[PDB]
Ligand SMILES: CCNS(=O)(=O)c1ccc2c(c1)CN(C)C(=O)N2
């Protein structure tokens with residue numbers, strides 16, 4: 001029932017780059033999903049205490065959330081776009097694993113994922 005330390009949002013020894021694709025991921029993809037009406041449950045790490053989900057971190061061992069992704073993008077944490085896309089995919093996957101199909105949180109994840117994929121379809125070529 002207690003929360004782990006959140007995922008790191010910086011790591012000085014980790015390698016990183018600024019790419020036009022990562023800029024797009026912050027300016028377009030994250031920004032669009034962040035403002036969505038269903039973004040709120042995904043804007044911070046799952047709080048197992050507040051939300052009374054005492055089993056959450058007994059099941060989900062690779063937690064991820066858009067608050068973490070936002071800070072990673074702001075902090076130039078990533079080496080490439082794929083590392084960031086992976087984080088979004090971990091967040092969605094965790095939600096589908098932990099919750100029941102048709103639960104409100106799943107409908108929210110599914111709407112955010114639809115939008116995510118629409119935005120990723122226009123990801124520019126690396127230039
Ligand atoms: C519709 C959201 N309801 S709630 O905030 O009680 C909630 C209910 C369930 C969860 C979460 C939030 C967050 N989340 C990422 C998750 O997988 N489960």
Ligand SMILES: [K+]
Pocket residue numbers: 096097098099100101
């Ligand atoms: K499930």
